mmCIF file with all atom_site columns, C-alpha atoms in Angstrom:
data_model
loop_
_atom_site.group_PDB
_atom_site.id
_atom_site.type_symbol
_atom_site.label_atom_id
_atom_site.label_alt_id
_atom_site.label_comp_id
_atom_site.label_asym_id
_atom_site.label_entity_id
_atom_site.label_seq_id
_atom_site.pdbx_PDB_ins_code
_atom_site.Cartn_x
_atom_site.Cartn_y
_atom_site.Cartn_z
_atom_site.occupancy
_atom_site.B_iso_or_equiv
_atom_site.pdbx_formal_charge
_atom_site.auth_seq_id
_atom_site.auth_comp_id
_atom_site.auth_asym_id
_atom_site.auth_atom_id
_atom_site.pdbx_PDB_model_num
ATOM 1   C CA . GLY A 1 1  ? -0.027 -0.112 0.184   1.00 0.00 ? 1  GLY A CA 1
ATOM 2   C CA . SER A 1 2  ? 2.531  2.592  1.273   1.00 0.00 ? 2  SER A CA 1
ATOM 3   C CA . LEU A 1 3  ? 5.080  -0.019 -0.089  1.00 0.00 ? 3  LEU A CA 1
ATOM 4   C CA . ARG A 1 4  ? 3.636  0.153  -3.492  1.00 0.00 ? 4  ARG A CA 1
ATOM 5   C CA . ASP A 1 5  ? 3.448  3.878  -3.763  1.00 0.00 ? 5  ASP A CA 1
ATOM 6   C CA . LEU A 1 6  ? 6.955  4.100  -2.863  1.00 0.00 ? 6  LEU A CA 1
ATOM 7   C CA . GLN A 1 7  ? 8.076  1.102  -4.984  1.00 0.00 ? 7  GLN A CA 1
ATOM 8   C CA . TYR A 1 8  ? 6.403  3.156  -7.965  1.00 0.00 ? 8  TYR A CA 1
ATOM 9   C CA . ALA A 1 9  ? 7.898  6.271  -7.009  1.00 0.00 ? 9  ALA A CA 1
ATOM 10  C CA . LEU A 1 10 ? 11.258 5.115  -6.873  1.00 0.00 ? 10 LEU A CA 1
ATOM 11  C CA . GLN A 1 11 ? 10.854 3.097  -10.129 1.00 0.00 ? 11 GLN A CA 1
ATOM 12  C CA . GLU A 1 12 ? 9.394  6.521  -11.548 1.00 0.00 ? 12 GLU A CA 1
ATOM 13  C CA . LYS A 1 13 ? 12.697 8.275  -10.392 1.00 0.00 ? 13 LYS A CA 1
ATOM 14  C CA . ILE A 1 14 ? 14.925 5.651  -11.900 1.00 0.00 ? 14 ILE A CA 1
ATOM 15  C CA . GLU A 1 15 ? 12.955 5.883  -15.152 1.00 0.00 ? 15 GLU A CA 1
ATOM 16  C CA . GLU A 1 16 ? 13.314 9.833  -14.910 1.00 0.00 ? 16 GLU A CA 1
ATOM 17  C CA . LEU A 1 17 ? 16.987 9.270  -14.317 1.00 0.00 ? 17 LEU A CA 1
ATOM 18  C CA . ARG A 1 18 ? 17.511 7.355  -17.456 1.00 0.00 ? 18 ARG A CA 1
ATOM 19  C CA . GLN A 1 19 ? 15.791 9.910  -19.757 1.00 0.00 ? 19 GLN A CA 1
ATOM 20  C CA . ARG A 1 20 ? 17.834 12.515 -18.185 1.00 0.00 ? 20 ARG A CA 1
ATOM 21  C CA . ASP A 1 21 ? 21.149 10.926 -18.777 1.00 0.00 ? 21 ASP A CA 1
ATOM 22  C CA . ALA A 1 22 ? 20.312 10.232 -22.259 1.00 0.00 ? 22 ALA A CA 1
ATOM 23  C CA . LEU A 1 23 ? 19.260 13.907 -22.647 1.00 0.00 ? 23 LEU A CA 1
ATOM 24  C CA . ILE A 1 24 ? 22.735 14.675 -21.350 1.00 0.00 ? 24 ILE A CA 1
ATOM 25  C CA . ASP A 1 25 ? 24.628 12.379 -23.855 1.00 0.00 ? 25 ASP A CA 1
ATOM 26  C CA . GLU A 1 26 ? 22.699 14.311 -26.715 1.00 0.00 ? 26 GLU A CA 1
ATOM 27  C CA . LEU A 1 27 ? 23.742 17.517 -25.346 1.00 0.00 ? 27 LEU A CA 1
ATOM 28  C CA . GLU A 1 28 ? 27.211 16.913 -24.575 1.00 0.00 ? 28 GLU A CA 1
ATOM 29  C CA . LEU A 1 29 ? 27.250 15.533 -28.348 1.00 0.00 ? 29 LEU A CA 1
ATOM 30  C CA . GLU A 1 30 ? 25.637 18.499 -29.622 1.00 0.00 ? 30 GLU A CA 1
ATOM 31  C CA . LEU A 1 31 ? 28.378 20.659 -27.742 1.00 0.00 ? 31 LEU A CA 1
ATOM 32  C CA . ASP A 1 32 ? 31.304 18.847 -29.299 1.00 0.00 ? 32 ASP A CA 1
ATOM 33  C CA . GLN A 1 33 ? 29.925 19.510 -32.592 1.00 0.00 ? 33 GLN A CA 1
ATOM 34  C CA . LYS A 1 34 ? 29.331 23.158 -32.382 1.00 0.00 ? 34 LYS A CA 1
ATOM 35  C CA . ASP A 1 35 ? 32.763 23.251 -30.525 1.00 0.00 ? 35 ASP A CA 1
ATOM 36  C CA . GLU A 1 36 ? 34.352 22.014 -33.859 1.00 0.00 ? 36 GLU A CA 1
ATOM 37  C CA . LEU A 1 37 ? 32.574 24.189 -35.822 1.00 0.00 ? 37 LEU A CA 1
ATOM 38  C CA . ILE A 1 38 ? 33.555 27.315 -33.918 1.00 0.00 ? 38 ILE A CA 1
ATOM 39  C CA . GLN A 1 39 ? 37.188 25.831 -34.398 1.00 0.00 ? 39 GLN A CA 1
ATOM 40  C CA . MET A 1 40 ? 36.593 25.604 -38.347 1.00 0.00 ? 40 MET A CA 1
ATOM 41  C CA . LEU A 1 41 ? 35.306 28.855 -38.526 1.00 0.00 ? 41 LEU A CA 1
ATOM 42  C CA . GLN A 1 42 ? 37.999 30.664 -36.261 1.00 0.00 ? 42 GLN A CA 1
ATOM 43  C CA . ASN A 1 43 ? 40.887 28.870 -38.374 1.00 0.00 ? 43 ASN A CA 1
ATOM 44  C CA . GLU A 1 44 ? 38.889 29.944 -41.764 1.00 0.00 ? 44 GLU A CA 1
ATOM 45  C CA . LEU A 1 45 ? 38.976 33.446 -40.277 1.00 0.00 ? 45 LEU A CA 1
ATOM 46  C CA . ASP A 1 46 ? 42.568 33.249 -39.666 1.00 0.00 ? 46 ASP A CA 1
ATOM 47  C CA . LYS A 1 47 ? 43.666 32.571 -42.950 1.00 0.00 ? 47 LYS A CA 1
ATOM 48  C CA . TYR A 1 48 ? 42.779 36.297 -43.609 1.00 0.00 ? 48 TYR A CA 1
ATOM 49  C CA . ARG A 1 49 ? 44.367 37.550 -40.645 1.00 0.00 ? 49 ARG A CA 1
ATOM 50  C CA . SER A 1 50 ? 47.336 35.326 -40.144 1.00 0.00 ? 50 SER A CA 1
ATOM 51  C CA . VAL A 1 51 ? 50.322 37.936 -40.373 1.00 0.00 ? 51 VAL A CA 1
ATOM 52  C CA . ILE A 1 52 ? 48.403 41.104 -38.915 1.00 0.00 ? 52 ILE A CA 1
ATOM 53  C CA . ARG A 1 53 ? 46.304 40.068 -36.078 1.00 0.00 ? 53 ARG A CA 1
ATOM 54  C CA . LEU B 2 1  ? 10.745 0.168  4.218   1.00 0.00 ? 1  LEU B CA 1
ATOM 55  C CA . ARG B 2 2  ? 13.234 2.830  5.518   1.00 0.00 ? 2  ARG B CA 1
ATOM 56  C CA . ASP B 2 3  ? 15.552 1.242  3.014   1.00 0.00 ? 3  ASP B CA 1
ATOM 57  C CA . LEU B 2 4  ? 12.978 2.445  0.280   1.00 0.00 ? 4  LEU B CA 1
ATOM 58  C CA . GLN B 2 5  ? 12.934 6.086  1.658   1.00 0.00 ? 5  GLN B CA 1
ATOM 59  C CA . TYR B 2 6  ? 16.528 6.364  1.682   1.00 0.00 ? 6  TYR B CA 1
ATOM 60  C CA . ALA B 2 7  ? 16.790 5.041  -1.854  1.00 0.00 ? 7  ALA B CA 1
ATOM 61  C CA . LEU B 2 8  ? 13.917 7.521  -2.828  1.00 0.00 ? 8  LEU B CA 1
ATOM 62  C CA . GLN B 2 9  ? 15.443 10.318 -1.157  1.00 0.00 ? 9  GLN B CA 1
ATOM 63  C CA . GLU B 2 10 ? 18.838 9.598  -3.068  1.00 0.00 ? 10 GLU B CA 1
ATOM 64  C CA . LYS B 2 11 ? 17.186 9.163  -6.337  1.00 0.00 ? 11 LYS B CA 1
ATOM 65  C CA . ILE B 2 12 ? 15.366 12.773 -5.731  1.00 0.00 ? 12 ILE B CA 1
ATOM 66  C CA . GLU B 2 13 ? 18.615 14.332 -5.081  1.00 0.00 ? 13 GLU B CA 1
ATOM 67  C CA . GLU B 2 14 ? 20.298 12.824 -7.957  1.00 0.00 ? 14 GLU B CA 1
ATOM 68  C CA . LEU B 2 15 ? 17.342 14.122 -10.351 1.00 0.00 ? 15 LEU B CA 1
ATOM 69  C CA . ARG B 2 16 ? 18.020 17.669 -8.831  1.00 0.00 ? 16 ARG B CA 1
ATOM 70  C CA . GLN B 2 17 ? 21.425 17.067 -10.029 1.00 0.00 ? 17 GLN B CA 1
ATOM 71  C CA . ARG B 2 18 ? 20.905 16.000 -13.476 1.00 0.00 ? 18 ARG B CA 1
ATOM 72  C CA . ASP B 2 19 ? 18.284 18.888 -14.012 1.00 0.00 ? 19 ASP B CA 1
ATOM 73  C CA . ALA B 2 20 ? 20.776 21.669 -12.806 1.00 0.00 ? 20 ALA B CA 1
ATOM 74  C CA . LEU B 2 21 ? 23.332 20.154 -15.230 1.00 0.00 ? 21 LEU B CA 1
ATOM 75  C CA . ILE B 2 22 ? 21.043 20.167 -17.981 1.00 0.00 ? 22 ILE B CA 1
ATOM 76  C CA . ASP B 2 23 ? 19.932 23.733 -17.422 1.00 0.00 ? 23 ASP B CA 1
ATOM 77  C CA . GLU B 2 24 ? 23.481 24.575 -17.429 1.00 0.00 ? 24 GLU B CA 1
ATOM 78  C CA . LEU B 2 25 ? 24.307 22.431 -20.911 1.00 0.00 ? 25 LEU B CA 1
ATOM 79  C CA . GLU B 2 26 ? 21.347 24.149 -22.420 1.00 0.00 ? 26 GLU B CA 1
ATOM 80  C CA . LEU B 2 27 ? 22.405 27.522 -21.825 1.00 0.00 ? 27 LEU B CA 1
ATOM 81  C CA . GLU B 2 28 ? 25.754 26.717 -23.163 1.00 0.00 ? 28 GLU B CA 1
ATOM 82  C CA . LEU B 2 29 ? 24.623 25.277 -26.273 1.00 0.00 ? 29 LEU B CA 1
ATOM 83  C CA . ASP B 2 30 ? 22.492 28.591 -26.886 1.00 0.00 ? 30 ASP B CA 1
ATOM 84  C CA . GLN B 2 31 ? 25.551 30.645 -26.272 1.00 0.00 ? 31 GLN B CA 1
ATOM 85  C CA . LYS B 2 32 ? 27.782 28.371 -28.836 1.00 0.00 ? 32 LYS B CA 1
ATOM 86  C CA . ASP B 2 33 ? 25.002 29.344 -31.227 1.00 0.00 ? 33 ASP B CA 1
ATOM 87  C CA . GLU B 2 34 ? 25.480 32.954 -30.698 1.00 0.00 ? 34 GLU B CA 1
ATOM 88  C CA . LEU B 2 35 ? 29.235 32.506 -31.092 1.00 0.00 ? 35 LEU B CA 1
ATOM 89  C CA . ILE B 2 36 ? 28.771 30.732 -34.179 1.00 0.00 ? 36 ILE B CA 1
ATOM 90  C CA . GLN B 2 37 ? 26.338 33.306 -35.764 1.00 0.00 ? 37 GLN B CA 1
ATOM 91  C CA . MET B 2 38 ? 28.634 35.843 -34.695 1.00 0.00 ? 38 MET B CA 1
ATOM 92  C CA . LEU B 2 39 ? 31.666 33.968 -36.180 1.00 0.00 ? 39 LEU B CA 1
ATOM 93  C CA . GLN B 2 40 ? 29.655 33.356 -39.429 1.00 0.00 ? 40 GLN B CA 1
ATOM 94  C CA . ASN B 2 41 ? 28.728 37.256 -39.894 1.00 0.00 ? 41 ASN B CA 1
ATOM 95  C CA . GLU B 2 42 ? 32.324 37.809 -39.458 1.00 0.00 ? 42 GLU B CA 1
ATOM 96  C CA . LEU B 2 43 ? 33.498 35.478 -42.276 1.00 0.00 ? 43 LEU B CA 1
ATOM 97  C CA . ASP B 2 44 ? 30.904 36.982 -44.505 1.00 0.00 ? 44 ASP B CA 1
ATOM 98  C CA . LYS B 2 45 ? 33.052 40.219 -44.497 1.00 0.00 ? 45 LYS B CA 1
ATOM 99  C CA . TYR B 2 46 ? 35.894 38.357 -45.999 1.00 0.00 ? 46 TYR B CA 1
ATOM 100 C CA . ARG B 2 47 ? 34.078 35.260 -47.951 1.00 0.00 ? 47 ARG B CA 1
#
């Protein structure tokens, strides 16, 4: 009764954590991609300012 | 049954931590998007 309520709440939290963890993985993946893009962009700009920056 | 309450409390705390991290990560990627846009606008001066 109370036991079942607790069991469900725990199980719910465990399922919530796994979704949270999956989201985090996707986010960190997205971050690395944007990081690489920022580098590509900065390197590209540097072609034009190599000597004078 | 105290074991279940302690277990639940720990998961609650962990969920709070996960949620805080997600907020940070999301703010970060929003900000990387702005840098990217800023850098593209800059590159457009050179093409």
